[PDB]
Symmetry: D2
Subunit: 140 residues, 4 copies
């Protein structure tokens, strides 16, 4: 269910109705140190000029990094929420796919940080996101 | 225009309703060379699976608004505008209502325009901000 | 003593030996919501090309925002430390002064955020720093 | 060169020992077009009043290293390099020893080069990172 980490028995929003399921984001690999996700390009991922929307690289990096953090911390009583997403854009994508790889570079008790790379179908680095994720005790 | 994006051309490659912006419901309200506003009604399409507005939705509203606010001025000078950096910081979740964005221009150079975007909930509280850096270049065709 | 907020009876490093005192940073106004600081340009503030070093705008914003946070939270048992400093540069400065104004835009229990503006002697916006400051209970 | 910055000119406006870099003691070790290293011995000149390395010192080491690493390649092509965005994130304080920086080039475009800089303490631990975006432009003289 986008293959998001299954950590709870109920989720307030079903994959298919969330922003992630509407645009088509899917997790491929997840480990505590490294995760990957990808998306086919369709108009839903696009802005009116025909290119993948800036916000789409933002949202992908945000979901991958956060949920890669939930994967470890949820069962320890904690919740994870993005505190900063800094996305920089090097090359546009008109069509094909966007592939993200998140590499964990810091795992602290109140903040985890992930370096995310967003690549096109030729493997070219099209964007990066520095993802900073607040970790806090879950509200009952 | 669809979403009331600025209309600076006679045709666009992708129609509003089919874009990410028109799928999640972003709408521009005011638009001047130094300040622009936009809003969006929260529905599940804007949320992540835990029931709150998706961090990426704030990113994307700020991106569209700061980008197109630049487009509204530079297109007719034969420039294009493409986001070069979006740095969004998150202070408070939104579960429902609206997200309202205001983009304030702080720097208008020949190659980069910079907009500070604030993202507020229905009670006026600052839930997120985004520093939008927009590259301005000549239309390559 | 750079006019930094006087909140403790002892400081591990005297103003004059710190980076701040070496380059000349001085606080003018401080309130919980807003603070200002400035610096004369000298070679110490410069890189080899003759212009104020990028890192100088970074360090100014970092000290102003952090210490404007210490001013309120120290006496409540808390300590403040920068968690992110994002500085963007719009115009160089060769000489004169750099003036910073920090505007608090969020004051949460674990993070305060400040918008800092770095201006030249003509008032022109030369850089900005988004300063994110972690607030944590002080280690005894 | 002073600080072992790249020597790409016969004269510089400000001598190494008088600059911020030479005042706090920054030194470049390796320098290639895709990767550069630099380090600095912690002394009080690097610290803030609470006894730890000043957040701005990390900012400044990353700024110099990513900037000059770009200079080393573009100067002789008649370009200049100036930092456009420095985004430093702080994970662990350093009280003493060294700070060691490695800058890894991740994007080399015609108008922007991007370097990921990591800042490590004497035990190898990642204390800070900086995303360095460098504008590349023609020397305006």
């Amino acid at each position: 269910g986008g293959n998001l980490p299954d950590v709870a028995s109920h989720y307030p929003v079903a994959y298919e109705q969330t922003l992630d399921g509407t645009v088509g984001f899917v997790i491929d690999e997840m480990t505590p140190e490294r995760a990957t996700a990808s998306v086919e390009v369709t108009d839903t991922l696009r802005q009116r000029w025909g290119l993948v929307h800036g916000g789409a690289y933002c949202a992908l990096a945000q979901m991958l990094a956060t949920e890669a953090t939930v994967a470890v911390v949820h069962e320890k009583g904690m919740m994870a929420v993005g505190q900063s997403n800094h996305t920089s854009f090097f090359r546009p994508v008109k069509e094909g796919h966007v592939r993200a790889e998140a590499v964990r570079i810091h795992a602290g008790s109140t903040t985890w940080f992930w370096d995310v790379s967003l690549r096109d179908d030729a493997g070219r680095l099209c964007a990066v996101s520095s993802m900073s994720i607040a970790v806090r005790p879950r509200r009952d």
